[PDB]
Amino acid sequence: HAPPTLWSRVTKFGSGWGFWVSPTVFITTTHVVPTGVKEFFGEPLSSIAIHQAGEFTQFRFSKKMRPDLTGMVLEEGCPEGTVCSVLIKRDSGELLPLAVRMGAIASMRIQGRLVHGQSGMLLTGANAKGMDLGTIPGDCGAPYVHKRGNDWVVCGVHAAATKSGNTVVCAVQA
């Protein structure tokens, strides 16, 4: 039930996607960040505070980059059992929320990189028939969000998946 303003925060970035938490804060998965660049979104590196670890990257810009947005809450993962929506966007702009039942926050090594993440299982009963790991786009960086009361919170960014157990991992901030 995510509103259009929430989806307007999901942005193509590098080899994947990221998400505007607020006018000044953008989050993504580290491995999709472009290298050898002198700017992100036109802003020089000298003007961006970067905080990243365990495949979670946060950029805090020195000016309002998306002044259209309200600041929302970024949490360091979510409680076990939370049903999150992964806000997957297609290149066409089509919106594909993917429901996931979240498990435990843990450190993991994935493809030789330390990941500070939260695992989850796709919630088949809350996704369109046939919309699963074998059919979604394979991009990273999409945000994991859930509702706290009536308000949406963001708690991670898509980092990994495996068909074994229909399992996904989001990286989480520390």
Ligand X SMILES: *[C@@H](O)[C@@H]1CCC(=O)NCCCCCCn2cc(nn2)C[C@H](NC(=O)OCc2ccccc2)C(=O)N[C@@H](CC2CCCCC2)C(=O)N1
Considering the rule CB under 5 A, would residue 6 count as an interface residue with Cl ion?
yes
Q: Which of 22, 24, 31, 144: binder of ligand X (CB under 6 A)?
A: 31
Q: Which of 41, 113, 126, 174: binder of ligand X (CB under 6 A)?
A: 113
Mark residues 28-57: x for contact with Cl ion by CB under 5 A, - for none.
------------------------x-----
Residues 6+ apart with CB under 8 A from 121: 100, 101, 103, 165, 166, 167, 168
Cβ–Cβ contacts within 10 Å for residue 159, how many? 29
Question: Do residues 101 and 123 touch, judged by C-beta distance below 8 A?
Answer: yes
- For residue 53, the minimal CB distance to Cl ion (Å) is 5
- For residue 165, the minimal CB distance to ligand X (Å) is 8
- Helix (H/G/I), strand (E/B), else coil: 60: strand
- Which does residue 129 bind out of ligand X, Cl ion, none, counting CB within 5 to 8 angstroms by kind? none
Stretch that binds Cl ion, among 4-12, 19-27, 130-138, 157-165 (CB under 5 A): 4-12
Match 């000016």 to its residue by tokens: 63
- For residue 5, the minimal CB distance to Cl ion (Å) is 4
Considering the rule CB under 6 A, would residue 98 count as an interface residue with ligand X?
no
Considering the rule CB under 6 A, would residue 119 count as an interface residue with ligand X?
yes
Take residue 158 and report the two structure tokens written for it. Answer: 């898509």
- For residue 168, the minimal CB distance to ligand X (Å) is 6
Q: Which of 88, 102, 161, 170: binder of ligand X (CB under 6 A)?
A: 161
Instruction: Report CA torsion sign: 94, 90, 61, 46.
Output: negative
Question: Do residues 6 and 22 touch, judged by C-beta distance below 8 A?
Answer: no
Active site positions, annotated = 31, 55, 140
- Name which of 100, 117, 104 is nearest 29 in CA terms: 117
